[PDB]
Design a protein around this ligand. Structure first.
Ligand SMILES: Cc1cc2nc3c(=O)[nH]c(=O)nc-3n(C[C@H](O)[C@H](O)[C@H](O)COP(=O)(O)OP(=O)(O)OC[C@H]3O[C@@H](n4cnc5c(N)ncnc54)[C@H](O)[C@@H]3O)c2cc1C
Ligand SMILES: *[C@H]1CC(=O)N(CC)C1=O
Length: 374
């Protein structure tokens, strides 16, 4: 029954959210090309023995050279650009249009990236519109080990208030995230017979359709992210007005968020009121580690989007935990302190979840039509 309300909300914002995500302000994301995987060599030592590929398509050996996993998951050249230490993504929403640099800086220098701890040994700005999440063929042992490690590190301090609650929330968030990716690779699948990317109903049923709970987890994630966006809206500063190109972005983000109001928000989705300060920080800490293990993903596009969504979820949790027991002054502070980096992650993550719900609707129709066919 809650699918009805959430999906209704999503039908109305779907197109407005899409256009926003395509704007100059939100279309790029800062990514460090240098991987720090605490296990195997992520950078060089490319994945051998297909320990990073999926059997799926009968056999890749019978498919053309340019349709292998390493290519389907690679970045587009003519899109990304070098990221400087002045990258707006490192700045706080408060520093974006601070009344003609109210914070002086008419001399010396100010490295916001280095300050806010963006120690990327080699960061670049990727065009998310030209590098969409899609089926890349990535999978196998590495993919499975990464997912397992993530799910297996669901261990909070015993003796705490809601240790069971935190454990359930963490699992659902990861599951919705995992499912979200499964829905996208099913929606954006490469038909090795026409070279066209098209919906693959059979894959979807296998990764999602026949496991209703994965669908439920995506709606849960959608509500969590939507609630975090709803919670910050009243404290968003005028972060875009001073920029000619993105002048209306702040207002256009308001158009979307305002259409999200639902009674579902009255619910304590991540148990903010039931988790001790110790679990809240442990919970947050687990997600940063998820964001870290993303460096072990060999597939580049998968890593980019993984970094985006995990960061998106970490931001949502930060918002919902902190804004919970906070006065108005603290709320403006909390929202004003989010980085552009974090806001892009949060909104882009909401975009992935919005498209996933839409894709489920779409696949359910394909399913219904194929059955009416036979
Ligand atoms: C962060 C990350 C990002 C990725 N991004 C992409 C991508 O953009 N494109 C692409 O083609 N591939 C991507 N992959 C891979 C994709 O997630 C699969 O791992 C892959 O298609 C191989 O499928 P599988 O059938 O081996 O495993 P999965 O379908 O990954 O299975 C893992 C195991 O967990 C279970 N499982 C599956 N989904 C859920 C869920 N939602 N909730 C609870 N359990 C579940 C399954 O039963 C199975 O035992 C990514 C992997 C990681 C680790
Ligand atoms: C998580 C925390 C812990 O000690 N275990 C057992 C190995 C977990 O599963």
């Amino acid at each position: 029954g809650s699918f009805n309300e959430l999906n209704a909300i999503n039908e109305n914002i779907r197109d407005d959210l899409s256009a926003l995500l395509k704007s100059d302000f939100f279309k790029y994301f800062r990514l460090d090309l240098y991987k720090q995987c605490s296990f195997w060599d992520a950078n060089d030592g490319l994945c051998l023995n297909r320990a990073c590929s999926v059997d799926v398509v009968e056999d890749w050996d019978t498919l053309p050279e340019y349709w292998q996993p390493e290519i389907l998951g690679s970045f587009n050249n003519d899109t990304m650009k070098e990221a400087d230490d002045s990258d707006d993504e490192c700045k706080f929403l408060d520093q974006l249009c601070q009344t003609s640099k109210k914070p002086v800086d008419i001399e010396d220098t100010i490295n916001y990236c280095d300050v806010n701890d963006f120690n990327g040994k080699n960061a670049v700005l990727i065009d998310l519109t030209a590098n969409p999440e899609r089926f890349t063929g990535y999978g196998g042992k590495q993919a499975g080990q990464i997912w397992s490690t993530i799910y297996q590190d669901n261990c909070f301090t015993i003796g705490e208030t809601g240790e069971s609650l935190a454990k359930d929330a963490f699992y659902r968030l990861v599951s919705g995230f995992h499912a979200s990716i499964g829905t996208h690779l099913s929606k954006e699948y490469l038909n090795t017979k026409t070279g066209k990317w098209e919906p693959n109903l059979d894959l979807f049923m296998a990764r999602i359709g026949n496991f209703p709970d994965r669908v439920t987890n995506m709606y849960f994630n959608y509500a969590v992210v939507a609630k975090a966006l709803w919670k910050i809206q009243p404290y968003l500063p005028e972060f875009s007005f001073c920029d000619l190109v993105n002048k209306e972005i702040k207002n256009k983000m308001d158009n979307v968020i305002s259409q999200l109001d639902t009674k579902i928000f009255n619910e304590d989705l991540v148990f903010a009121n039931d988790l001790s300060l110790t679990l809240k920080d442990e919970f947050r800490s687990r997600f940063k580690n998820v964001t870290k293990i993303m460096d072990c993903v060999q597939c580049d596009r998968c890593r980019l989007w993984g970094k985006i969504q995990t960061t998106g979820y970490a931001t949502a949790l930060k918002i919902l935990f902190e804004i919970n027991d906070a006065d108005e002054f603290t709320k403006q502070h909390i929202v004003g302190k989010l980085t552009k980096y974090e806001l892009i992650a949060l909104l882009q993550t909401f975009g992935r979840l919005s498209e996933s719900i839409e894709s489920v609707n779409m696949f359910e129709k394909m399913y219904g039509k194929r059955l009416l066919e036979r």
